[PDB]
């Protein structure tokens, strides 16, 4: 079945750092998901569990009702010849392992790996939107869950993403694959510059792409969400 496509509507905005602000505008230069992006749509229910590229960050948005999706695997070759990463959430805890695994052809839910030879890091604990990044050997996860029942597509609205955990793993990453009615979206991040508005309490309420269309560019230049009649200078081609 050929892949389907859709458009995200101002989604994937997370707090760039751990510094509090209030009632101020701020410009940041970091990896984001561009507005009105061309995100790929998958249907897992006929099977669709393809290994998807992990270029420099993935915005993983999944809608669930019976908790069908389990986790993700991260690595390069996934044949125990190199180092691999594991994040599995079963009914009790979120297992995290960094070992050499002989991953199976179709790992679902427990047929995951044939064997585990060498292990480096382990950890055992006691609508969803996720963002994964790997910079300077740190694996960062931003997440926030919000219920929705409005439309069967991706609803349009603005929601911030709060930092959850940072795992000092520091491995080489190029590919990933999800661990399995169920559907999920996959979007790719890329380096852009954004403008963020903080309300009185300190929660992101709106954003503007600095380089989407000329009006948004002028808004970014003026550092204001309202622009009056006139002519303004932007840049040089």
């Amino acid at each position: 079945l050929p892949p389907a496509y859709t458009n995200s509507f101002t989604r994937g905005v997370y707090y760039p750092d751990k510094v509090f602000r209030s009632s101020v505008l701020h410009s940041t230069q970091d990896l984001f998901l561009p507005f009105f992006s061309n995100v790929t749509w998958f249907h897992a229910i006929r099977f669709d569990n393809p290994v998807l590229p992990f270029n420099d960050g993935v915005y993983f948005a999944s809608t669930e009702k019976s908790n069908i999706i389990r986790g993700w695997i991260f690595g390069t070759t996934l044949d125990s010849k190199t180092q691999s990463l594991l994040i599995v959430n079963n009914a009790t805890n979120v297992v995290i392992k960094v070992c050499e695994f002989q991953f199976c052809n179709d790992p679902f839910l427990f047929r995951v790996y044939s064997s585990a030879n060498n292990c480096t890091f382990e950890y055992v604990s006691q609508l969803r939107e996720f963002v994964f990044k790997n910079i300077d050997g740190y694996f960062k996860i931003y997440s926030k869950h919000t219920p929705i029942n409005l439309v069967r597509d991706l609803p349009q609205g603005f929601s911030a993403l709060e930092p959850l955990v940072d795992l000092p793993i520091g491995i080489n990453i190029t590919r990933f694959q999800t661990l399995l009615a169920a559907a999920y979206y996959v979007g790719y991040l890329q380096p852009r510059t954004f403008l963020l508005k903080y309300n009185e309490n300190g929660t992101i309420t709106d954003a503007v792409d600095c380089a989407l269309d000329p009006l948004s560019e002028t808004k970014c230049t003026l550092k204001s969400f309202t622009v009056e009649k006139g002519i303004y200078q932007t840049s040089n081609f």
Binding site: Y15, K18, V19, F20, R21, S22, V24, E162, P163, P168, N201, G202
Partner: protein, 296 residues
Amino acid sequence: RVQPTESIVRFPNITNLCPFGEVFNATRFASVYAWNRKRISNCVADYSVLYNSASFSTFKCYGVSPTKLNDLCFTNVYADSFVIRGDEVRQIAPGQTGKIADYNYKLPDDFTGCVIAWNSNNLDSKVGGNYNYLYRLFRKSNLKPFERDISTEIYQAGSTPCNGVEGFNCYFPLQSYGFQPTYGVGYQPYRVVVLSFELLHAPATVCGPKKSTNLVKNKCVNFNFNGLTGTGVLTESNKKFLPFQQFGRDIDDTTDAVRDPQTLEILDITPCSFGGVSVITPGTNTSNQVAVLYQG
């Protein structure tokens, strides 16, 4: 300016000692081409037993003064250990050339850390031959900083691709050190360790020995909060920090809120009043009495 009266420091509880027992007292070192890396955190780094202890040959390092080491809160210090020849100790520096500095191990230009090297001739000398140390000699291009390669393929010097024959114009990139006690000091094997770390970019866990003190409010004091330094009064805060935020900033890009690393309470900081001084006089010809105006 209202002169600050007291000084306070706030650090969390740290009791573990950094795992330097297996770093400097290591019984064996790894090959330099496949250099070792280790992550150190959640410990107090006492440098009084490094600079003021067993004589290390060199302690060249830039960016951070060695004396002030115990007074800073670092961020995810790194330890790298390997063995290089005595002539090769000079190559471990930014803006350096050489086979080791270009094909084996490179440092970034803005490197902040301390490199340590000491004599290791006695423990790494064999009369029959100490050939357990391997070094890189041939590679495609200059290694990027903080990058490791362990590929072992027959290097093609010119034309006539080797295809794994190691014939003419085909040499093995990896060669073995031969270490006798009956050699020179310049050829003597050296055990060298490299420390690299960040500074004030994230919540920190390594801070060194610094006795914590009490806290005071509504008085112009000097304060140290996880290494951050500044002058101002401490007051109760009405802001609402999220449980993932540890600092507060304003339009002026200067900190105005800070969370206590012990009581988990947020504090507001405001500057001490400075103003200006003006003198009011009717002229020295008429009288000498004057009036002083402390502005604003």
